[PDB]
Design a protein around this ligand. Structure first.
Ligand SMILES: Nc1nc2c(ncn2[C@@H]2O[C@H](COP(=O)(O)OP(=O)(O)OP(=O)(O)O)[C@@H](O)[C@H]2O)c(=O)[nH]1
Ligand SMILES: Nc1ncnc2c1ncn2[C@@H]1O[C@H](CSCC[C@H](N)C(=O)O)[C@@H](O)[C@H]1O
Length: 262
């Protein structure tokens, strides 16, 4: 069994005290106090992202791992961190988000960030049963953690099934969350999908150590197995610390406000 599987079982044997110290050890982090402490203040235009997801997408975009353009489809948009971030970019003509919403899942929040006007987010949409549509940029950030690697594997495999349908419609810019990249069956489907659609897997340092999520991005390249093992080793390397030095903090993105005519 793989290093990720070993990391996983090791993650689950930890106590609560250690788990909480561990999951944010040496990771990158944005302070959300400002964001959340400007909900009741009734401010749609302070540039405060709706989620931590925006900073994740920025990290990738900044490094040219994906370059949003044209019609953007955002699968499992949730609150809209990714959809609104895309909306601020000048090559983006349209942003269409879909999320399931409902009990125990995020709905699309209203915001008035820069270019919010080209954003349409529909809740009550299970993407597993949404016919695909042509897009230029396909974003997908779906994947529910579970203590069981096997469940995350089945969940990942299921997501990789439908993503493939949307990718077959032409989008050359893409960014797909891979919940459990370290299980063998997942590696096998990913090699096949890479063979066909290109791209690579990238670890975003804003991800917590309690998860192994990697992003399949059009702007990346290289050997998946190796990329995945490198991430597993880093995650294991952060275990068993005597002194927990905590995370390193980053200023959140400023998404501004107003509209744009495209
Ligand atoms: N040892 C230990 N492992 C845990 C515990 N809670 C979760 N895990 C493991 O960590 C994995 C993912 O943790 P999450 O808490 O979902 O990760 P997160 O993104 O920080 O989630 P939120 O902070 O709840 O939004 C789970 O699938 C478990 O394998 C815990 O109390 N103890
Ligand atoms: N089958 C499904 N169909 C549509 N959305 C789903 C889904 N399964 C999970 N999701 C949604 O996918 C979302 C991922 S979290 C969305 C984060 C977003 N990128 C942001 O920046 O805010 C969750 O809210 C969840 O409700």
């Amino acid at each position: 069994r793989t290093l990720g599987e070993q990391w996983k079982e090791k993650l689950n044997a930890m106590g609560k005290e250690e788990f909480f110290s561990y999951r944010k050890e040496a990771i990158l982090e944005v302070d959300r106090t400002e964001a959340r402490r400007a909900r009741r203040e009734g401010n749609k235009v302070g540039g405060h992202p709706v989620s931590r997801g925006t900073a994740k997408l920025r990290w990738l975009v900044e490094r040219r791992f994906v370059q949003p353009i044209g019609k953007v489809v955002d699968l499992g948009c949730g609150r809209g961190g990714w959809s609104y971030y895309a909306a601020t970019m000048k090559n983006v003509q349209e942003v269409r988000g879909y999320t399931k919403g409902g009990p125990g899942h995020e709905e699309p929040m209203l915001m008035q960030s820069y270019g919010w006007n080209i954003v349409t987010m529909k809740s009550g949409v299970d993407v597993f049963y949404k016919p695909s549509e042509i897009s230029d940029t396909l974003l997908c950030d779906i994947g529910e953690s579970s203590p069981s690697a096997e469940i995350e594997e089945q969940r990942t495999l299921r997501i990789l099934e439908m993503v493939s349908d949307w990718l077959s419609r032409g989008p050359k810019e893409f960014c797909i969350k891979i919940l459990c990249p370290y299980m063998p069956k997942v590696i096998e489907k990913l090699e096949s999908l890479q063979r066909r659609f290109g791209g690579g897997l990238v670890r975003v340092p804003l991800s917590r150590n309690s998860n192994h999520e990697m992003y399949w991005v059009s702007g990346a390249s290289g050997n998946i197995v190796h990329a995945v093992n490198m991430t597993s080793q880093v995650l294991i390397g952060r275990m068993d610390k005597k002194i927990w030095k905590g995370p390193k903090y980053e200023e959140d993105v400023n998404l501004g406000s107003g509209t744009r005519a495209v």
